[PDB]
Design a protein around this ligand. Structure first.
Ligand code: AMP
Length: 268
């Protein structure tokens, strides 16, 4: 059940930590546009293709974060089907994986990519500080990771804080316009923490995605509100979502069909 093609990304997206808000916003937009199922939209927002039924994960992209203009960057291995962070490459060339035995030749980092794993309690998410400095510190801490850092309690804690930072500023920002917008603001000519609404959105990507998709089924259908996210209408949901996870909703596309539409449309 090992992954395939981790070393053969579908695309590579690059960001310099010192760049402007504008550069960051289009970096995020670029990732969404390249991940989209060209044939499957919902309320003008892109929707991911389904996870392929019975193969191991074979669709990956890389994000490269450079702490400096010419410096080699930190490479993130992210799944193209569900935007999971599963690996990062260090300056010594070691692949660290976040799921034991998922990436050929990798070394397990010692924890996973859920906020439960990273923070102990998911409520701690609204105390994580985001900004340009945090981004630079997170990238440097993971780029400078050595194998000996794994048996160090405090090093493991710092690595978790660094991964948590990348997850919010890269993965969740891709998923959510609220998050990407929030981060772009911190990079304008610088520290912030997300509120409880963004925390609820980030913990409910599937639910919020599935709720938009339901409104698209052809009737024989209203939007179910999600109070804790602050999202009470289809339009607020469309404005909150950057890209939807594919969810098999009753009367909408099935996994099989959406996948054939993916292939027929020039998607890989
Ligand atoms: N490795 C990961 N990278 C990014 N997001 C993740 C990862 N693992 C879990 N998540 C997020 O957590 C949500 C729920 O995870 P789970 O409920 O444990 O299947 C997912 O839909 C993702 O938004």
């Amino acid at each position: 059940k090992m992954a395939k093609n981790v070393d053969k990304p579908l695309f590579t997206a690059t960001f310099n930590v010192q760049a402007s808000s504008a550069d960051y916003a289009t970096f995020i937009a670029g990732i969404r546009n390249k991940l989209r199922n060209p044939a499957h939209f919902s309320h003008n927002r892109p929707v991911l293709p389904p996870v392929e039924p019975n193969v191991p994960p074979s669709r990956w992209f890389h994000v490269v974060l450079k702490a400096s203009p010419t410096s080699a960057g930190l490479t993130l291995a992210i799944r193209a089907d569900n935007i999971y962070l599963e690996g990062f490459k260090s300056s010594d060339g070691t692949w660290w994986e976040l799921t034991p035995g998922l990436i050929p030749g990798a070394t397990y980092v010692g924890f996973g990519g859920t906020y439960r794993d990273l923070l102990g309690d998911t409520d701690k998410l609204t105390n994580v500080a985001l900004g340009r400095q945090q981004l630079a510190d997170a990238v440097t801490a993971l780029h400078g990771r050595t194998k000996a850092d794994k048996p160090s309690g405090p090093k493991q804690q710092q690595a978790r804080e660094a991964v948590t930072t990348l997850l919010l500023m890269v993965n969740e920002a891709t998923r959510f316009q609220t998050v990407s917008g929030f981060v772009a603001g911190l990079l304008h000519p610088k520290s912030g923490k997300i509120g409880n609404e963004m925390k609820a959105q980030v913990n409910g990507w599937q639910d919020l995605s599935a709720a938009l998709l339901k409104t698209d089924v052809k009737p024989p259908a209203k939007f179910a509100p999600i109070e804790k996210m602050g999202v009470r209408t289809a339009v607020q949901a469309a404005n909150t979502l950057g890209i939807l996870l594919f969810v098999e909703v009753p009367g909408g596309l099935t996994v099989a069909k959406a996948l054939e539409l993916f292939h027929a449309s020039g998607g890989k």
